[PDB]
Design a protein around this nucleic acid. Sequence first.
RNA 1: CUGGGGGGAGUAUGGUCGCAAGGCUGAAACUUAAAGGAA
Lengths: 43, 218, 851
Amino acid sequence: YNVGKAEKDGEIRLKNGVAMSKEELTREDKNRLRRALKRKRSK
Amino acid sequence: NKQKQLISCGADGLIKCLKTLDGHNNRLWALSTMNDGDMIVSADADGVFQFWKDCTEQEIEEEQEKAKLQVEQEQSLQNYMSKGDWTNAFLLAMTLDHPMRLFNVLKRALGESRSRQEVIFNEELDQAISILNDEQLILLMKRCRDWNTNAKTHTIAQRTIRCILMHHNIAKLSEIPGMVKIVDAIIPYTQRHFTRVDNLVEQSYILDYALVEMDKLF
Amino acid sequence: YQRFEQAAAFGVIASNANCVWIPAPGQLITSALEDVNIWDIKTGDLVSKLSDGLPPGASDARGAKPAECTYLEAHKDTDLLAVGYADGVIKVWDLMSKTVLLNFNGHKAAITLLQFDGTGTRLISGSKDSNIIVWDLVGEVGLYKLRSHKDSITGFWCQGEDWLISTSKDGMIKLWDLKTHQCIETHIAHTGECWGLAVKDDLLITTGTDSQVKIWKLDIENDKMGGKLTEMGIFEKQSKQRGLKIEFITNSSDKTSFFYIQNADKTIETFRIRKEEEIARGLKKREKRLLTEEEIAKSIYSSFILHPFQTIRSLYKIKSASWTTVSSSKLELVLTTSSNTIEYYSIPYEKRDPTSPAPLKTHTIELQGQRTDVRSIDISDDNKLLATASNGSLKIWNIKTHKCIRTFECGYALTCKFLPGGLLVILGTRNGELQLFDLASSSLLDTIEDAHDAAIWSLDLTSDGKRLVTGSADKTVKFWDFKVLKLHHDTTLELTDDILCVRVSPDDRYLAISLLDNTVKVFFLDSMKFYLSLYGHKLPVLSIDISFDSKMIITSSADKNIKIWGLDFGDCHKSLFAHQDSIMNVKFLPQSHNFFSCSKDAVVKYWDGEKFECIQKLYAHQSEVWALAVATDGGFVVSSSHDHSIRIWEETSLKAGERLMEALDLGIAEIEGLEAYNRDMKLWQRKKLGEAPIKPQGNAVLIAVNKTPEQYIMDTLLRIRMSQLEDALMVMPFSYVLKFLKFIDTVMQNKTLLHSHLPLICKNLFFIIKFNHKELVSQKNEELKLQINRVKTELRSALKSTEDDLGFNVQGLKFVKQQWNLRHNYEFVDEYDQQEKESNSARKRVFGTVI
RNA sequence: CUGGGGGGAGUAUGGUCGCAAGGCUGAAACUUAAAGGAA
């Protein structure tokens, strides 16, 4: 078993293990996680 | 009432498309919708009837009442994260399914449990984790599974697994459908963490060797 | 170069903002665009136009639109005006000397409310972006930033230091503890937006999208989580649109309270709230017919405690309001509407009857405006100015005073001109009508009904003025002469297409007409000869201009570019792309080949016709610039726009290892300082209490970052990286190793941050003593010997404590899996079928190998 | 229902007669809009 992505859609699950919920993330971390996902797509 | 319309006998009345209704067991020659504006809709099979309710505005009030509930008891979890009292914070973050806040309530309750002084959290928190049902404990072990894959966040996961194991019934935990693909996933992580902490405590005895050299010094 | 600048701006009285009222009825501070103007309601003369000290158009004016004023707010007693603008900045002025005292940028979008609090020295500000910031005025500092809303702050209400309560452009109302600056209680007020908020101390009132006005009971001394602010019932209004300002008063002389809800459209609903005596003596009357049903009726309160009142209407759409009161028969309410006009109404009320079928305005300040956008501007020789509107408000302003001295009523009028002697105005309207006015006498010399079959679009005089040209959307142009002061239609040229601009040359030579069919045609006036056809603009084509030498024409259009044409052969010269929306008008200078073009994107632009540069990019308007007019001689140019404005333009580094070493030295210095303080306390409590040490004050950086020294050292030990950790621990000498051992010895007494950093403490400590083992076992001190023993016991106890539950969980989880297996795995006794079953049911993973 | 050049398979062409390339379109007298293409 390895930590993939979330089986929901209001959730963000990093491969670290730290599952974050989109309703609980503030807008700063929403923008930051969106840019980080853009980096991991762009590579 | 202007433009959407009811049709019959797929096995069911269907409105215009959306909202396949309950229907019947067999076929149908029936629609009477013609009370006041568009009130009670009688729809009849060979024998069985339905008297369909009213203007469909009842659901929206119920639909608009949940969002208000969820945004109310989202601003109780932030107050609990502020002022402590981690038990209702725990069960309410379990109800909202907020995972990193769940990790925060378990981690800071565990840290203060290490601070002060059979029981591994405060006793009201581990009875609150004792009284939770199958869906909540299976999602709790889904995310104990994915917390256990770290070497940092593994201790919180191991102690939550420990209190589940010593506060629930083991046959119940086996019979919950889904909890044999989780425990197979995070037995070998516990095995490698056991080997790592055992290696760490076996290389911990250079302190004892340094003490016996420092005693042979004089 | 002799550049341009802005002399004065006018034409606006009330713009896209609120209004504050000051007592002497009284005066009124309101917004013009980007500057605030004060007016006395009594007469209405402009007694102040407080503006920025820099003229827009100067050398240091920056290359964007100026910040439109969006919220006025006034501190009455200490005489301040806090005004806030469209970019987010807040300027606080003293109204005595009219200078800027405070600049308070802070925000990121436009701001929506201000409020002074504790009457002086504190200002709270809410903005389009969902933040709400508290500012001190004795420190010039944003104190706090309350940050949990989602869309845009629509209102708030604060009391001093403890409770604020805001409501925003999502559906949410929030209550803020201003000691911790964390939001305490959040509700969904209305299902769409939430536009209103007012409160007289017991009851709170909010409104949302459509007529549903909600009463709330805030109980400030509550202790439950949900229940500091509860909802007590809804009611209805007569307007189905956005009620967007609610405000309360307590009239004296008995004690009574009134609140208004202004609406989007045209209407302010006023309400009297009643008093507790008629609450008590009205409860029984709806409690008649005598109790579950009666309790449901008594619960279903709003119409009970609130009483509607005289619903004040207006002619136009309502933008802001505020009132004053005496006697409860002088509810005197000032009101700024959208089409620029303020109105001072006042409703009387004899404490039972409102004494009128409809309220009465006592004043109206509307003379210096237009109520619509000025579709055509014009100028005299140099003295007067002509503004043409849609309601009919032709106005003849003057340049030297900026006051309309003469005004008439025409209709939807889109183009106009003067007459060459002055004191006479020709004009054409949207429908088939033309009109003539003057300056000394009354309005109408004559109108010509059926001047054209359809919408007129552009007219032009000849340079002597006796003969004018009218081109209209009935696909015709017509010529008119002046017979003696009346209009003589004599000839008419019908085209195939809707002519929408005309012009003659300034020397009676050419007639250039711009058709809807993407082209212009140049005719000879003396023959109707069809000299030229200029083509290739690619959208319908607006204003033309002919140069003073009658050699060079300009051609503007909705293609966002103006074309320069040489009129001798009809050959193009440039096609320069300006103005990213649409160039509405373009005009030469008097004597030069320089020209101006004003456009539909709130900018006028100064060009030359020789190098075809842009000389200047003037940036004072806020919205679509509909017209501009140049002086006949001298060359100052006026421009008039959609924001009801008319404005003049005239001429002028350690690393890891040493970071850990300095952190270790200050941390262990603080630690043994406190331990010496504790030994002093025990000795001066176990001996003759006559003396002790005075005080060890804690470290500057430790109280600055709010950390115990174990936490400070622990996070810098965290912040070094794993690649240079074995170097950071190898650089430090043995004295720092000994105080590192003191740090570890102290940190495994606080068992909270021992267990959260166990493998880091183990890795660092074991590398440290493994590297320094030769010197450590040669140190002779029983203090360090007891130290090593204590660290050994506590560290190994923590490690065996975590692997105890690790081993417990291994055996328990494999018991759970194994009892599930022996409950319902399968039935094979034969070993070959068993092993093939397990091979088919195993976990597979596919790997990329190399052969 | 009479009228006929000269073998088959190829190859070359500084001759004669043709057909054919360019290069973002709009878009030139205009370094110019919208939109489209391409990458």
